[PDB]
Amino acid sequence: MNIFEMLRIDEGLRLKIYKDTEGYYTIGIGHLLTKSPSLNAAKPELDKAIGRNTNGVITKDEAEKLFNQDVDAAVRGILRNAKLKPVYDSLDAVRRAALINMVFQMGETGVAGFTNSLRMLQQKRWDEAAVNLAKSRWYNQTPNRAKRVITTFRTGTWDAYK
Ligand SMILES: [Cl-]
Ligand SMILES: [Cl-]
C-alpha cells in the first residue's frame, strides 16, 4: 500500500463531472474543479485543466494525470508550510501518508488549522491525537474516511485499508 492506492480507495474514480460530498463540482480522483454552483463555471475549469474541449468527460489516463499532479502539489504544500513541515518531518512513512491524505481532502490551510492535534502528533501521543482529531466537522461529515485516516495515525500501519 502507498499514498496513491490509499487516496484511490478514499476518493474513488469517476470519469464524468460529479458532485463531491459537500456538493462541489469534481472529476477523476477527487480533483475539485470549482466551488461555484454553475456547471457552466465547472465545464471551463475542466477544459482548462485538461488542455482540451472535453464536454465534461475525460479518460482514465487524463484522470490519472490530474491525480499525479494533485499528490505532488499536496506534498509540496506540506513542505512549504511552516506549521506542517515540522510535523511531516517528525513522522514515520505510514503516518506521513495519513497527513498527505488530510491535506489532499481539505487543503493545507484547513489542516494547518488543527493546531492541537498537530502538536500531539509531533509529540507522538497517538491515542490522544486520535481522540482530538475526532472532534471535528471533518469527522462528523465523512466519518468512515476520517476513521480510516485516524486509525492510520493511531497505529502506524495500513490495517484500516486492508
Ligand atoms: Cl489543475
Ligand atoms: Cl465517509
Curated annotation (Swiss-Prot):
UniProt keyword Hydrolase, yes or no: yes
Intracellular or extracellular location(s): Host cytoplasm
Keyword Zinc listed: no
Active site, renumbered: 11, 20
Effect of residue 26 to H: Facilitates transglycosylation more effectively than hydrolysis; covalently bound substrate
GO molecular function, one term: lysozyme activity
Source organism superkingdom: Viruses
Induction: Expressed late in the viral replication.
CDD domains assigned to the protein according to its UniProt record, in alphabetical order: T4-like_lys
Predominant subcellular localization, coarse grouping: host cell
GO BP annotations, alphabetical order: cell wall macromolecule catabolic process; defense response to bacterium; peptidoglycan catabolic process; viral release from host cell by cytolysis
Reactions accelerated catalytically: Hydrolysis of (1->4)-beta-linkages between N-acetylmuramic acid and N-acetyl-D-glucosamine residues in a peptidoglycan and between N-acetyl-D-glucosamine residues in chitodextrins
Protein residues bound to substrate: 32, 104, 117, 132
Similarity-based family: Belongs to the glycosyl hydrolase 24 family.
PANTHER family: T4-TYPE LYSOZYME 1-RELATED (PTHR37406:SF1)
Protein name as it appears in the record: Endolysin
Source species: Enterobacteria phage T4
Taxonomic classification: Viruses, Duplodnaviria, Heunggongvirae, Uroviricota, Caudoviricetes
Recorded name of the encoding gene: E
